[PDB]
Amino acid sequence: MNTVPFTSAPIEVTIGIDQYSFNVKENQPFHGIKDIPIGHVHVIHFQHADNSSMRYGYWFDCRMGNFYIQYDPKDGLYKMMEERDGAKFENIVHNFKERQMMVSYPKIDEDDTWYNLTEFVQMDKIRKIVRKDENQFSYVDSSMTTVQENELSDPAHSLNYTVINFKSREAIRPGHEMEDFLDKSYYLNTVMLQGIFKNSSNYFGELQFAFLNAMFFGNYGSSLQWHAMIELICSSATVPKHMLDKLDEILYYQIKTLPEQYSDILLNERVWNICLYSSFQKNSLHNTEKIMENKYPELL
Amino acid sequence: GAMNSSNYAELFNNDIKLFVDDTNVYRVTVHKTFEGNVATKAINGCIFTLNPKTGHLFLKIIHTSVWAGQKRLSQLAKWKTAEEVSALVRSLPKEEQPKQIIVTRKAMLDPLEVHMLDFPNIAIRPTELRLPFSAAMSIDKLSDVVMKATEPQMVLFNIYDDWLDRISSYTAFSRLTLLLRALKTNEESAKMILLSDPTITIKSYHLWPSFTDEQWITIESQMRDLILTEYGRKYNV
Numbered sequence: 133m134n135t136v137p138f139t140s141a142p143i144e145v146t147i148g149i150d151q152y153s154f155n156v157k158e159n160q161p162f163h164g165i166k167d168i169p170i171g172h173v174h175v176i177h178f179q180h181a182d183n184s185s186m187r188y189g190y191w192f193d194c195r196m197g198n199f200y201i202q203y204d205p206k207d208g209l210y211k212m213m214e215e216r217d218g219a220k221f222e223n224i225v226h227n228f229k230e231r232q233m234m235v236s237y238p239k240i241d242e243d244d245t246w247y248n249l250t251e252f253v254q255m256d257k258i259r260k261i262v263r264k265d266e267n268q269f270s271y272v273d274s275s276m277t278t279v280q281e282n283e284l285s286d287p288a289h290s291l292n293y294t295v296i297n298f299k300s301r302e303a304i305r306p307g308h309e310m311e312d313f314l315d316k317s318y319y320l321n322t323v324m325l326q327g328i329f330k331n332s333s334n335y336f337g338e339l340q341f342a343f344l345n346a347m348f349f350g351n352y353g354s355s356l357q358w359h360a361m362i363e364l365i366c367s368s369a370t371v372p373k374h375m376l377d378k379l380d381e382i383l384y385y386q387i388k389t390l391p392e393q394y395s396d397i398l399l400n401e402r403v404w405n406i407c408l409y410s411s412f413q414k415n416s417l418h419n420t421e422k423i424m425e426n427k428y429p430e431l432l
Numbered sequence: 433g434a435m436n437s438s439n440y441a442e443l444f445n446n447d448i449k450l451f452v453d454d455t456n457v458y459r460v461t462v463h464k465t466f467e468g469n470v471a472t473k474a475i476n477g478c479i480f481t482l483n484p485k486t487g488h489l490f491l492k493i494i495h496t497s498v499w500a501g502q503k504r505l506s507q508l509a510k511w512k513t514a515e516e517v518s519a520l521v522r523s524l525p526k527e528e529q530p531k532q533i534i535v536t537r538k539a540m541l542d543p544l545e546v547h548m549l550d551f552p553n554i555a556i557r558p559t560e561l562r563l564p565f566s567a568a569m570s571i572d573k574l575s576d577v578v579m580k581a582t583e584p585q586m587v588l589f590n591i592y593d594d595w596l597d598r599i600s601s602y603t604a605f606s607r608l609t610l611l612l613r614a615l616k617t618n619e620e621s622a623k624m625i626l627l628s629d630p631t632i633t634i635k636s637y638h639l640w641p642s643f644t645d646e647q648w649i650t651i652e653s654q655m656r657d658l659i660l661t662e663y664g665r666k667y668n669v
Contacts, residue, residue, distance in 0.1 A: 301549050309546045310511035
């Protein structure tokens with residue numbers, strides 16, 4: 133059970149930790165979040181009461197170091213930092229715990245929601261999508277654009293998701309134009325799984341990370357990447373059975389967790405209608421099709 | 433984006449462009465089987481690829497053999513059209529290759545784009561114009577070479593005959609679109625109008641009769657009359 137202490141809370145802010153969130157008042161004696169489950173990535177995220185624009189946050193894993201949050205009054209945001217002095221950090225945390233100035237990560241024992249959303253997400257993969265190698269944690273916000281969005285402008289502040297483009301020489305073998313356009317199995321299986329991701333786990337981890345960035349920060353390019361990665365599988369006639377079974381579970385928890393009021397901007401009608409009703413895998417996503425139809429029947 | 437009435441003059445500028453019509457690529461007669469089910473029999477088709485500026489027509493003949501043992505033929509017909517257009521471009525010297533290809537039907541956009549990925553500087557555009565290039569098979573000499581083909585064949589025509597000696601591309605294209613619109617709306621009437629006077633013949637190297645400038649005005653008037661009548665009937669107005 134790990135801890136992210138906060139130096140202080142000088143500005144009024146909604147704090148997210150994974151799928152939970154808490155309102156903190158200006159100069160409220162809030163000193164951080166305890167009982168954070170070891171074994172998963174986590175994200176701590178912020179929306180200022182005064183500017184409901186720029187949701188932003190930090191992806192981290194407590195196994196990789198001691199992390200705390202301090203407000204920077206110059207840059208005007210809550211910053212994640214590493215404390216390299218182990219004994220100082222244990223001493224800071226123990227004091228704030230004794231004074232009970234910390235909120236407890238409020239996990240129900242029965243509840244595998246966060247495991248189900250982050251099953252394949254690894255910090256080492258996040259740090260290759262979000263490039264800032266001097267830190268063990270990763271900053272994301274609402275406004276950060278993707279390498280792909282940037283091609284169609286600051287490379288250092290980009291999300292380096294794997295570029296997927298159905299009308300690209302990477303996607304289409306010379307002499308197999310119609311076959312490769314209508315059946316993306318070669319693009320999925322040879323180019324993406326064998327070629328770039330190496331295994332379905334890395335592919336699913338990227339998909340799950342794009343979802344969560346879409347959901348927690350309203351990051352538009354992340355939402356594009358999540359849909360493109362769903363569409364590449366559903367548009368492939370030849371997908372390993374284990375991959376289809378896992379995709380169904382993955383998308384089920386994503387759709388289950390989505391705020392009901394964000395399905396208008398976070399869900400792409402064309403991609404979902406195509407994937408569930410027209411595509412090769414139209415009959416392979418039973419759980420996902422049942423929750424989509426019962427929760428978002430307007431969209432379909 | 434899309435080619436329309438607003439940007440019509442662009443057809444006759446000095447950027448090489450080609451229209452591609454795929455509407456006569458896959459052609460069938462529907463008939464009853466002995467058991468009283470329905471079946472199709474394919475007949476020879478053609479891709480209609482036209483430079484509107486020069487009148488140069490690249491008539492790629494689609495022999496029924498290409499459909500042998502294939503499925504989803506109306507889908508394959510779009511990709512076969514895109515393969516052949518792609519092959520035609522690569523066959524042309526660089527300075528002859530188009531800078532734009534305009535497809536008469538939006539269903540050709542993705543097939544042609546995917547086949548032309550090697551040519552990122554060639555723009556693939558739709559049009560809002562309702563062009564009558566479907567009636568190309570009402571031109572007797574084009575119909576004749578398609579039906580007689582025993583194998584895949586490319587045949588080169590100038591669809592303007594020698595008109596550009598006396599008129600601009602804009603006027604020649606207008607004349608062609610009016611003739612094809614007539615042939616499409618009432619083939620028998622249109623063909624009667626064109627051949628009724630036996631003294632005006634079609635040269636061996638031409639598609640259309642050798643009309644004087646004055647005879648063309650009369651003919652063009654007869655075609656506009658034919659089109660309006662048929663419209664009044666179609667719509668009871």
